[model samples]
Target: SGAIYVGNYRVVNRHLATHNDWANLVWEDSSRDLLVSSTTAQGCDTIARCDCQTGVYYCSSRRKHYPVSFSKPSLIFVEASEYYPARYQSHLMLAVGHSEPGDCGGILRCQHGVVGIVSTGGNGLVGFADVRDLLWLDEE
Candidate 1:
């Protein structure tokens, strides 16, 4: 479980760039059962899920599963009470993409950006739990 900490993903336009139009679970992207940013795009059901073992991210249902780089980004760590609560209690975040949907993990984009959680544009991953509830998961 001790994988590399890539870093925090960045936001583009108004939402995330990773968020885009893609097919379901592509069947090519190595998916698992954990998610960082669960989404609800047209093709995928999750914004992003993971394979705790490999630390990979996906945008399909897969429905759950979701990384970024082994470097770059910034490895964003945050609290729950201040934001979203979790079982582990913390979240490690990383942006997915700004232009391409298959940049790193899944996409968290809105045609505009700054989409909300549960919104048509939002992927539900408006970022969480593997967010390990992201860093948390890896830490454990």
Candidate 2:
């Protein structure tokens, strides 16, 4: 059986939105090989679980009074090559920009660049990368 890898997932329900409320899941190869989970916002309450071989994405919410309902958009790609060292391999950079007039945004870099955007309701930029060979620093 093949492995399944879950990328990243973001929640965008304003009414049910919290500083720490999001979840993500990833299955490495199959529904039983490996799994990765993460949570951010409201004391890291969000979570995600997946089947490694099945490539299935699962998400859950844990807010007491917030209703889950928000628009989500595809992840975006950003340009980041200066952060990695010269001998780094199999890595990528993920980023997000400001969506609204006063909404602050930032960037996220990791070994793998999976999900790009969180939700469409907010205006922002995101980026990711999949490396096959060693990334060289651009001397331009």
Candidate 3:
């Protein structure tokens, strides 16, 4: 019942193991009098060196909010946590206030088989999507 709102977490917009891949899980930061930048230090979930299948879970450090932008997006990596019927409950950041890490703006699961794309947060947001859904048409 605080600075909470809808966000785009777990919504993987890139195929697994793609050079340019990222997921945005940000909320409107009620702070910042002038430059309104999202306080969530870690904004979304990301992968590593073109790898989104195994060991592809990303953190918040790899993201850049465009030099002069406030859209500080980042992610969270959970080794062993709680899930309905799975593990590796990596989450996203959608907090409206200052964030540290693991605030979980969204709910994300890795790899195939146990792949999870459920919606979390108070606004009911889509957590994660299959990598295939983010692939662009081969027109080159």
Candidate 2 has its poorest 10 consecutive residues by lDDT at 51-60
On TM-score, the leading prediction is: 1
Q: Give the TM-score of candidate 3.
A: 0.17
Candidate 1 structure quality by residue, lDDT tens digits, 14-125: 2222333122111111111122321242221222333322233434434553333321212343223222332221232333422122222343322222111210112333
Candidate 2 runs further than 4 Å off: 1-44, 48-78, 85-96, 99-124, 128-140
lDDT of all predictions, in order shown?
0.25, 0.22, 0.23
Give the TM-score (vs. native) of candidate 2: 0.17
> Rank by lDDT, descending?
1, 3, 2
In the range 102-122, model 2's lDDT, one tens digit per residue, is 121111112242221111112
- The ten-residue window of minimal lDDT in model 3 covers 27-36
Task: State residue 65's C-alpha deviation in candidate 1, in Å.
Answer: 8.3
Error of 3 at 36 (Å): 21
